[PDB]
Amino acid sequence: SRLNRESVIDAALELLNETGIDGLTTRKLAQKLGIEQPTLYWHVKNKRALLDALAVEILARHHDYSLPAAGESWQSFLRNNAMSFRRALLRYRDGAKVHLGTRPDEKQYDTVETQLRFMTENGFSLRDGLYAISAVSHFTLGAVLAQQEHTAALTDRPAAPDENLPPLLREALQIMDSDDGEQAFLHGLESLIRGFEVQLTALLQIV
Amino acid sequence: SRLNRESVIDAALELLNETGIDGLTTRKLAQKLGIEQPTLYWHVKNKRALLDALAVEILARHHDYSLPAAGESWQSFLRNNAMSFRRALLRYRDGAKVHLGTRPDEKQYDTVETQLRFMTENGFSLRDGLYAISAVSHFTLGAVLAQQEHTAALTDRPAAPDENLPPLLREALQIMDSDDGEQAFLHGLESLIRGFEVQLTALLQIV
Ligand SMILES: CN(C)c1ccc(O)c2c1C[C@H]1C[C@H]3[C@H](N(C)C)C(O)=C(C(N)=O)C(=O)[C@@]3(O)C(O)=C1C2=O
Ligand SMILES: CN(C)c1ccc(O)c2c1C[C@H]1C[C@H]3[C@H](N(C)C)C(O)=C(C(N)=O)C(=O)[C@@]3(O)C(O)=C1C2=O
Ligand SMILES: [Cl-]
Ligand SMILES: [Cl-]
Ligand SMILES: [Cl-]
Ligand SMILES: [Cl-]
Ligand SMILES: [Cl-]
Ligand SMILES: [Cl-]
Ligand SMILES: [Cl-]
Ligand SMILES: [Cl-]
Ligand SMILES: [Cl-]
Ligand SMILES: [Cl-]
Ligand SMILES: [Cl-]
Ligand SMILES: [Cl-]
Ligand SMILES: [Mg+2]
Ligand SMILES: [Mg+2]
Numbered sequence: 001s002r003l004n005r006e007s008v009i010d011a012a013l014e015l016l017n018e019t020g021i022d023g024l025t026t027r028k029l030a031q032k033l034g035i036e037q038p039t040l041y042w043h044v045k046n047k048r049a050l051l052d053a054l055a056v057e058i059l060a061r062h063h064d065y066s067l068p069a070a071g072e073s074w075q076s077f078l079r080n081n082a083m084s085f086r087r088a089l090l091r092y093r094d095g096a097k098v099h100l101g102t103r104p105d106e107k108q109y110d111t112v113e114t115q116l117r118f119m120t121e122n123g124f125s126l127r128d129g130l131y132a133i134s135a136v137s138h139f140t141l142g143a144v145l146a147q148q149e150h151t152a153a154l155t156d157r158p159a160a161p162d163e164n165l166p167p168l169l170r171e172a173l174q175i176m177d178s179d180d181g182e183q184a185f186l187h188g189l190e191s192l193i194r195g196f197e198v199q200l201t202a203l204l205q206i207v
Numbered sequence: 208s209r210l211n212r213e214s215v216i217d218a219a220l221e222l223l224n225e226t227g228i229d230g231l232t233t234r235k236l237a238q239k240l241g242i243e244q245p246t247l248y249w250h251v252k253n254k255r256a257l258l259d260a261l262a263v264e265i266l267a268r269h270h271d272y273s274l275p276a277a278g279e280s281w282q283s284f285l286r287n288n289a290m291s292f293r294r295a296l297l298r299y300r301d302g303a304k305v306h307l308g309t310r311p312d313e314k315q316y317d318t319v320e321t322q323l324r325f326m327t328e329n330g331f332s333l334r335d336g337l338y339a340i341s342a343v344s345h346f347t348l349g350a351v352l353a354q355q356e357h358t359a360a361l362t363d364r365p366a367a368p369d370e371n372l373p374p375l376l377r378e379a380l381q382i383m384d385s386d387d388g389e390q391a392f393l394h395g396l397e398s399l400i401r402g403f404e405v406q407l408t409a410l411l412q413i414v
Contacts, residue, residue: 139395
């Protein structure tokens with residue numbers, strides 16, 4: 001099949017959804033594409049370059065809320081931003097493991113820059129705007145990794161069904177796995193944003 | 208060398224610090240221990256059982272603040288808890304990648320149970336206590352993964368040194384990598400806790 005950037009990325013994401021990150025290799029990618037490894041090598045040097053590119057593309061394709069709406073509050077933008085980040089990461093198997101250790105790509109510079117200018121225009125210093133952005137990303141990444149990687153681990157070996165857990169831990173785990181972890185996440189996200197709001201409004205006051 | 212649980216775990220953590228999670232194998236563990244693979248297999252069935260055990264042991268050894276102090280506020284306990292969780296995860300290379308997708312171990316039941324009882328005795332429902340605990344873990348895990356995995360990625364290929372970044376993104380990344388990410392983390396952690404505090408005190412009031 002065809003080996004332009006787009007087709008290589010499409011085949012790569014298919015294979016990622018078939019086999020997960022740890023068994024995504026240039027060997028199996030070559031196989032999926034019906035080509036010899038030294039053909040693929042012309043197009044994709046290594047698994048790292050491949051992972052770097054999927055990270056960027058999963059967002060370009062599926063992270064629809066990168067930009068604030070005209071007039072949107074910074075709280076609403078961080079919420080809508082986080083929800084969209086979470087969506088994009090969950091869309092492919094081990095997606096958050098793919099995102100891990102990427103930095104914004106040149107094709108995301110203007111997007112990430114705008115996001116920081118927007119914060120700073122709402123009364124954040126660069127530094128608190130940065131911390132808010134970073135906290136939202138790290139929170140959202142952990143929440144999606146815990147969920148994806150809890151799941152991957154269960155494929156490999158089960159858990160004790162209850163007949164062994166102490167009572168609170170027993171009902172806590174029933175609750176946290178009764179949706180995908182979406183309510184733990186949406187609740188944590190409100191706590192985080194209100195925390196940034198309390199910090200920002202305080203200004204020089206001891207808070 | 209000796210193959211009791213303790214010695215296998217010690218050798219495993221050494222190898223983890225030498226080679227990272229992705230090149231930690233039962234082959235190289237057998238080599239490190241100076242034994243044949245079918246000898247190791249008696250002791251350790253697979254990489255999963257091995258990862259499950261290192262996850263538990265890295266905490267037992269190095270997560271000193273699992274328990275609140277008598278009289279300690281829930282805010283102070285979540286802070287001291289998170290800081291200690293972060294420490295334990297950073298102590299070994301790809302440590303957070305090791306923790307990912309573990310659930311509390313039987314030898315951590317009484318610890319995690321106590322943590323939930325403590326929250327609920329401070330006025331959290333099980334559910335908000337749970338969300339607070341989960342948010343603190345997911346935040347702390349993302350923060351440590353972003354840092355560890357940003358680092359692992361740099362071994363594999365560098366970044367653009369500045370002569371290409373737009374201005375805010377340029378100075379943001381200088382700031383966020385001028386310590387290990389410890390100030391982004393400690394700031395995010397205060398925002399999260401104050402957010403849980405605002406939620407809890409509100410009770411039935413629209414907040
Ligand atoms: C400059 N800024 C503080 C940093 C620092 C370190 C980082 O590792 C990153 C950023 C920007 C953030 C912005 C976030 C943004 N959001 C908070 C989720 C975001 O929506 C995007 C995006 N491309 O739309 C990211 O690049 C992003 O996911 C991302 O991957 C980032 C990222 O990796
Ligand atoms: C029951 N509780 C809500 C859950 C649910 C899902 C989970 O995946 C987990 C917990 C408890 C938390 C407690 C946290 C605690 N802390 C908030 C960091 C903690 O200090 C410990 C500990 N063993 O001391 C954990 O087990 C812990 O790191 C952990 O790994 C957990 C964990 O994995
Ligand atoms: Cl074709
Ligand atoms: Cl082609
Ligand atoms: Cl193309
Ligand atoms: Cl490869
Ligand atoms: Cl293969
Ligand atoms: Cl986890
Ligand atoms: Cl010996
Ligand atoms: Cl022995
Ligand atoms: Cl032992
Ligand atoms: Cl193995
Ligand atoms: Cl090997
Ligand atoms: Cl990251
Ligand atoms: Mg990122
Ligand atoms: Mg855990």
